Design an enzyme around this catalytic site. Structure first.
Site, PDB file in Angstrom:
ATOM      1  N   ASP A 231      13.409  19.569 -19.182  1.00 48.15           N
ATOM      2  CA  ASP A 231      14.253  18.397 -19.405  1.00 48.15           C
ATOM      3  C   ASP A 231      13.431  17.172 -19.794  1.00 48.15           C
ATOM      4  O   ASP A 231      12.879  16.480 -18.932  1.00 48.15           O
ATOM      5  CB  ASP A 231      15.087  18.117 -18.150  1.00 48.15           C
ATOM      6  CG  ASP A 231      16.148  17.079 -18.383  1.00 48.15           C
ATOM      7  OD1 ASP A 231      16.161  16.507 -19.491  1.00 48.15           O
ATOM      8  OD2 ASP A 231      16.968  16.850 -17.473  1.00 48.15           O
ATOM      9  N   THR A 232      13.400  16.870 -21.096  1.00 49.76           N
ATOM     10  CA  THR A 232      12.670  15.707 -21.586  1.00 49.76           C
ATOM     11  C   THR A 232      13.304  14.392 -21.157  1.00 49.76           C
ATOM     12  O   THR A 232      12.645  13.347 -21.232  1.00 49.76           O
ATOM     13  CB  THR A 232      12.573  15.751 -23.114  1.00 49.76           C
ATOM     14  OG1 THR A 232      13.887  15.684 -23.688  1.00 49.76           O
ATOM     15  CG2 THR A 232      11.885  17.030 -23.562  1.00 49.76           C
ATOM     16  N   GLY A 233      14.557  14.411 -20.715  1.00 48.50           N
ATOM     17  CA  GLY A 233      15.215  13.220 -20.232  1.00 48.50           C
ATOM     18  C   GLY A 233      15.003  12.923 -18.764  1.00 48.50           C
ATOM     19  O   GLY A 233      15.555  11.948 -18.249  1.00 48.50           O
TER      20      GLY A 233
HETATM   21  C1  LIG Z   1      20.829  11.079 -17.583  1.00 54.21           C
HETATM   22  C2  LIG Z   1      19.303  11.193 -17.796  1.00 54.21           C
HETATM   23  C3  LIG Z   1      18.740   9.829 -18.252  1.00 54.21           C
HETATM   24  C4  LIG Z   1      18.627  11.573 -16.469  1.00 54.21           C
HETATM   25  N1  LIG Z   1      18.998  12.972 -16.069  1.00 54.21           N
HETATM   26  C5  LIG Z   1      18.338  14.113 -16.845  1.00 54.21           C
HETATM   27  C6  LIG Z   1      19.366  14.747 -17.831  1.00 54.21           C
HETATM   28  O1  LIG Z   1      18.737  15.676 -18.630  1.00 54.21           O
HETATM   29  C7  LIG Z   1      20.466  15.434 -17.011  1.00 54.21           C
HETATM   30  C8  LIG Z   1      19.954  16.695 -16.315  1.00 54.21           C
HETATM   31  C9  LIG Z   1      21.193  17.418 -15.696  1.00 54.21           C
HETATM   32  C10 LIG Z   1      21.822  18.652 -16.407  1.00 54.21           C
HETATM   33  C11 LIG Z   1      23.044  19.348 -15.799  1.00 54.21           C
HETATM   34  C12 LIG Z   1      23.649  18.836 -14.475  1.00 54.21           C
HETATM   35  C13 LIG Z   1      23.022  17.609 -13.765  1.00 54.21           C
HETATM   36  C14 LIG Z   1      21.797  16.904 -14.375  1.00 54.21           C
HETATM   37  N2  LIG Z   1      21.503  15.867 -17.942  1.00 54.21           N
HETATM   38  C15 LIG Z   1      22.836  15.185 -18.056  1.00 54.21           C
HETATM   39  O2  LIG Z   1      23.212  14.373 -17.240  1.00 54.21           O
HETATM   40  O3  LIG Z   1      23.617  15.557 -19.182  1.00 54.21           O
HETATM   41  C16 LIG Z   1      25.083  15.221 -19.153  1.00 54.21           C
HETATM   42  C17 LIG Z   1      25.430  14.931 -20.341  1.00 54.21           C
HETATM   43  O4  LIG Z   1      25.503  16.417 -21.065  1.00 54.21           O
HETATM   44  C18 LIG Z   1      26.009  17.210 -20.193  1.00 54.21           C
HETATM   45  O5  LIG Z   1      25.144  18.504 -20.043  1.00 54.21           O
HETATM   46  C19 LIG Z   1      24.452  18.352 -18.922  1.00 54.21           C
HETATM   47  C20 LIG Z   1      25.299  17.336 -18.000  1.00 54.21           C
HETATM   48  C21 LIG Z   1      25.921  16.487 -18.827  1.00 54.21           C
HETATM   49  S1  LIG Z   1      19.170  13.229 -14.395  1.00 54.21           S
HETATM   50  O6  LIG Z   1      19.510  14.624 -14.074  1.00 54.21           O
HETATM   51  O7  LIG Z   1      20.242  12.422 -13.799  1.00 54.21           O
HETATM   52  C22 LIG Z   1      17.571  12.797 -13.707  1.00 54.21           C
HETATM   53  C23 LIG Z   1      16.477  13.885 -13.575  1.00 54.21           C
HETATM   54  C24 LIG Z   1      15.110  13.483 -12.999  1.00 54.21           C
HETATM   55  C25 LIG Z   1      14.859  12.007 -12.569  1.00 54.21           C
HETATM   56  C26 LIG Z   1      15.914  10.974 -12.704  1.00 54.21           C
HETATM   57  C27 LIG Z   1      17.316  11.358 -13.286  1.00 54.21           C
HETATM   58  O8  LIG Z   1      15.462   9.845 -12.280  1.00 54.21           O
HETATM   59  C28 LIG Z   1      13.942  10.021 -12.101  1.00 54.21           C
HETATM   60  O9  LIG Z   1      13.706  11.358 -12.009  1.00 54.21           O
END
Ligand SMILES: CC(C)CN(C[C@@H](O)[C@H](Cc1ccccc1)NC(=O)O[C@H]1CO[C@H]2OCC[C@H]21)S(=O)(=O)c1ccc2c(c1)OCO2
Lengths: 99, 99
Positions: A25-27
């Protein structure tokens, strides 16, 4: 290897003697793993995303093997719906985005 | 370009004729942008993240240029903590993970 993004970039990891599936997860600044009972000391932390914040336990200097590539760093454990490999470990395995 | 991950992979995007900063987020299935005005019809939808679910406005078939690469796809608008480019658009610009 090269991973296309047609589907979720899930890979097998090894941590605390267990094999698990986790997102590259690059995000994610940090690595967040589903609830598991790791030994050792930890510190409370809160991380926020879509929907709000969750409470997690921060463990430091944890060994993780990501698709055969070894890494060691901070790992957060809490009620996340998915195992998330963040940038703190992706850098250690030489992972890059390319387009 | 090849993008290393020692810093957040933030890039400039153009949507609705306006420039913004967004995060290339391989852990997101969908693209979610902070509150903004976009022309055309939208449908109310729900999306879940690490902290729960939020209400968003779904815009279909939206033109969006990411780091000079054009994409046309679904854009969700709502109270996300940061503008994120998800896999639905990352695939369109040919983005892959490599290590
Ligand atoms: C929102 C971004 C800026 C941050 N997120 C990483 C994402 O990759 C997250 C990772 C994620 C993936 C699935 C379920 C929960 C989190 N994906 C996500 O929210 O995507 C949403 C939008 O598309 C849909 O597909 C996935 C969920 C929906 S996160 O999970 O909340 C997160 C991970 C590590 C962290 C953090 C926040 O703060 C510091 O360390």
């Amino acid at each position: 290897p090269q991973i296309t993004l047609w589907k979720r970039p899930l890979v097998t990891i090894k941590i605390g003697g267990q094999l698990k599936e986790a997102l590259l997860d690059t995000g994610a600044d940090d690595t967040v793993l589903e609830e598991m009972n790791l030994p050792g000391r930890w510190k409370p932390k809160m991380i926020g995303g879509i929907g709000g914040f969750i409470k997690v336990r921060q463990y430091d200097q944890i060994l993780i093997e990501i698709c055969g590539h070894k890494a060691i760093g901070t790992v957060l454990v809490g009620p996340t719906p998915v195992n998330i490999i963040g940038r703190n470990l992706l850098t250690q395995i030489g992972c890059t985005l390319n387009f």
